[PDB]
Amino acid sequence: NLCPFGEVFNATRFASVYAWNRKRISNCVADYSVLYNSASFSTFKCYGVSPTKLNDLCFTNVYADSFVIRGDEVRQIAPGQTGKIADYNYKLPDDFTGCVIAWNSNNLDSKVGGNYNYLYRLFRKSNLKPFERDISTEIYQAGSTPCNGVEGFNCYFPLQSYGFQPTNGVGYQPYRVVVLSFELLHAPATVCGP
Amino acid sequence: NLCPFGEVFNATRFASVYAWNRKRISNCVADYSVLYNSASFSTFKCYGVSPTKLNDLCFTNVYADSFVIRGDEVRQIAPGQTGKIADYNYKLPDDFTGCVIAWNSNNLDSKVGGNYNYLYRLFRKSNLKPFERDISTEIYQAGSTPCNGVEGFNCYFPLQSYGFQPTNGVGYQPYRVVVLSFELLHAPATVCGP
Amino acid sequence: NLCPFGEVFNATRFASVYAWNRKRISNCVADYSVLYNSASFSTFKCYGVSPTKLNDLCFTNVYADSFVIRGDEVRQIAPGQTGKIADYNYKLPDDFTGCVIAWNSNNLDSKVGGNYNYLYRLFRKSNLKPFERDISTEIYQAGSTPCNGVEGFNCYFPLQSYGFQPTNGVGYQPYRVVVLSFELLHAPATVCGP
Amino acid sequence: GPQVQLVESGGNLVQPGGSLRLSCAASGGTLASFAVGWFRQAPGKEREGVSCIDVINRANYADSVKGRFTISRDSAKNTVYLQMNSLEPEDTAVYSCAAHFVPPGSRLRGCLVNELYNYWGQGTQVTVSS
Amino acid sequence: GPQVQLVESGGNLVQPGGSLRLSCAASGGTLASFAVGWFRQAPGKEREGVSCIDVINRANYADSVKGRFTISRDSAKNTVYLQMNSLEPEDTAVYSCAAHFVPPGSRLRGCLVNELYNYWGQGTQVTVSS
Amino acid sequence: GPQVQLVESGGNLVQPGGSLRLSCAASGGTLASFAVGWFRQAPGKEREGVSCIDVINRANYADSVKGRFTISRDSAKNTVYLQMNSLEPEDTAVYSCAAHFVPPGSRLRGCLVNELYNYWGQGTQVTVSS
């Protein structure tokens, strides 16, 4: 009983970071041999778990949050980090047990005319709790007077496009990120591995 | 404190199968006598429970799922089944404990010109987990060429209309289905009956 | 370590009563004597509990329901009440446990031309169960001929606009209402008094 | 959208015998709370009511358009439609939308006898010519 | 909407060499279950098919509009568009929309050889003049 | 789609003194990130700017249209509107929409630089005549 990790990583398209997609993974035998075969992960950062012994570990449930950001922002997909991505789109908890994995997707998510389909939340009055998804598009209030849903001066739409051209600098290029959150309970583990 | 079974069976509108409706039934008296009296049921199959003892059993919670499908598809509303409905629209677990009730609704859901308002999902990249629900309208990649949110060759809209006309074969007439799901937990029961 | 009621009371936007908003309150100390400090409250009525004992009670969960209604309709936000709001929009149980808080909001939710953005449900086939929420827009069948989703004679859109003008009588002026429902289950308490 | 506003659509240059459907999309509230009436102003003539509809969806038409026009309601889109059939050059006018609120008790405001509306759209032009 | 209904939009008075995108919005079901065809009727001439699209989104065009028109599908909006480029006065006509249901077994009902459609719109008028 | 596209709508044949609200709908991204400008092009003359809006929603108007036209944003519909009032025969032109991406590091970008507009619609025809 395999795990559809070739569905999360080898997905044709990924979600926008403000609406990061999440997959439920359990009832399978997880293989990290596929991860060893891969040779294009720019980031390979594991928190509170072994990046080696995970083939021996067992967990109750596994969650794979997948989204797309730019290389400058992959720094923020980390516990205790701040910025536009961590505060308003995808926040990681400090007690994060799992790994974040990203890779350069300029061959897929960049077009010569500029790919603007990947969005990100630019404005929010509060900050997101860990693993919180905000898909609202309310008119953000940036000035004194309320907006009543009308766009104008200091009353802005909260979302923004990224603009992914191939000729961009490495810092401003699309980076698909997949955050594997290893959840273990007081319930016997359903995800294990060989 | 009667369980609102009439709200489920005698509803004016029924959901499309891909967006199947669900009402939780808890903390009430389930009088299944109303289902015993009716003679209009074309299908009445209970699994893991005796159909004649419903008035004598207690459950933690009951769920009533309701939708509309064709006649030749009511057989897919059973545990262990396959097909477009069972795989892509509404899926029962193998250990299902409940009853599947269905009846012909040609006089309600068929129109002379043809009623096309009931939809079903025709394509999906993977099969549904039991009781999963997919209401997305993302363009389905039928081939290996990406779609990028555009319909074309091998890039199909995943939903489809039924086409219910009163002169159709009985296998293509509209049937209203109610799936009762008896939840058995290691807890005090809240739905019992007379 | 103190319950953030300000997110609920001092919020800039309030939901329509038919689509009433709900926010959960947990993992904090609820000082209700500090909440009662706002002398702007025209209605602060608790049911099933003594108001002075509030700072000496613990509950499993507390829910904050907020919405906007007319002035003379606040009398319906109480156990055992009937009317358009109690029957079709927001319904408290007979054995309700919590407080109903309300204040005149004519300065915020009224415009000189008339604010019609706050809605309410006018027709419904049955009354609401306690804490039931109906945001559907099914064409209400007032006559005997079915509507099939088409508005016409005896086939009415179920929702209706209020119409808040600052020169209305105090009973037709907008009021904002917060209900703090106190829930006791067989689970650890998350809200307590100081 | 704090204030109620109406916007018309569907205007076009058409031929005699053709047909048009005009839309009246409302904003800032439920149009199902409002009586809606359609008007037309031809060049040189006075403004003329053509069709209206109650909040209980009773329709009425001017004698000059009876049997040819149909007013209808689609409150799911906050819209009231006006289907115009068998258009003649005398129909050439600016067709404008108009609304006024109806309180639930006074559920009779709306009939074309109540031809004093509070909110107005900018109008859409229908030109019928060969 | 218990019955399928098609509504065309986008008709305008344009100039020779201009462009237009006509929309065919469907109500009462998914237009993705239907082969959609575009027809035009000029004054004095017969009704003439110009373009159609399969349910597998194969497009066909009349020889008079090939290379200038593009039919495309937007089922998310229950719509089929007709992009008209390089308009000429001969393109002046009422452009109507038509559809017919395609059951899942017979996934060939659609090609312009299947020019017998069951549902129709009232058509939108396109006038090309200097 | 994979690339940003713009489509204009709302053009019509209107009368002197009439009103019109054009629309500029966007695809392939959120229009809130793009500076949008409206352009008109009378036949036999070079296209001239009409109005434009910042990403922070500051408006600019050509002198010929200031006092009559109103540009506004509606990113909920991914749209920029152009409300035209008191139309006169000199306003007859194809009204085109244009877009230009403003990065979040250049948010105070002035709206008036015409030479930066990278994406263009096909234009909707507005004809003002008696």
Author numbering:
A (entry chain F), B (entry chain C), C (entry chain D): 334 to 527
D (entry chain A), E (entry chain B), F (entry chain E): 1 to 130
Text taken from the publication that reported this structure:
Herein, we found that Nb22, among our previously reported nanobodies, exhibited ultrapotent neutralization against Delta variant with an IC50 value of 0.41 ng/ml (5.13 pM). Nb22 adopts a typical β-barreled structure, and contains three variable complementarity-determining regions (CDR) binding to RBD. Furthermore, the crystal structural analysis revealed that the binding of Nb22 to WH01 and Delta RBDs both effectively blocked the binding of RBD to hACE2.
Initially, we determined the crystal structure of the WH01 RBD-Nb22 complex at a resolution of 2.7 Å. The buried surface area (BSA) was 800 Å2, mainly constituting of hydrogen bonds and hydrophobic interactions. A total of 14 residues constituting epitope of three CDRs were identified using a distance of <4 Å as the cutoff. The side chain of P104 inserted into the hydrophobic cavity formed by F101, R107, Y453, F456, and Y495. Apart from the five hydrogen bonds in CDR regions, the interface of Nb22 and RBD was stabilized by two additional hydrogen bonds consisting of G1, S75, N450, and E484. Interactions were also facilitated by the hydrophobic network constituted by P2, Q3, V4, G28, G29, R73, and D74 of Nb22. The binding site of Nb22 on RBD overlaps with that of hACE2, and the loop (V102-Y117) of Nb22 clashes with two α-helixes of the N-terminus of hACE2.
